[PDB]
């Protein structure tokens, strides 16, 4: 019975962290 | 060409929080469960996500869209 909620919450923020960073490279 | 290491975990990591059935996860109770984990998720930080996500009535937010936007720009 784990957690596996926790772990899709892990993967998901690493993938607000290139949502924020992505678009935005120059002008 | 065009991975999708972000697309996927992010569709299948929203899907493991889905509640309203066809995929859509609440922005009240997402923000707290994000930002209680991993490395204390911001509030802000959280805040902008679901906001460009959708959010719509309550605060239905559609990972499909949120993802694809993600990705599509």
Request: proline fraction near 0%; charged fraction near 40%; charge should be negative.
């Amino acid at each position: 019975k784990r957690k596996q909620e926790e772990v899709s919450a892990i993967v998901i923020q690493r993938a607000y962290r290139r949502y924020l960073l992505k678009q935005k490279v120059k002008k | 060409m065009k991975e999708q290491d972000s697309e996927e975990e992010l569709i299948e990591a929203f899907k493991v929080f889905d509640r309203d059935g066809n995929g859509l996860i609440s922005a009240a109770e997402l923000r707290h469960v994000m930002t209680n984990l991993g490395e204390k998720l911001t509030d802000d930080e959280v805040d902008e996500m679901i906001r460009e996500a959708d959010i719509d009535g309550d605060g239905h937010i559609n990972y499909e869209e949120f993802v694809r936007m993600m990705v599509s720009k």
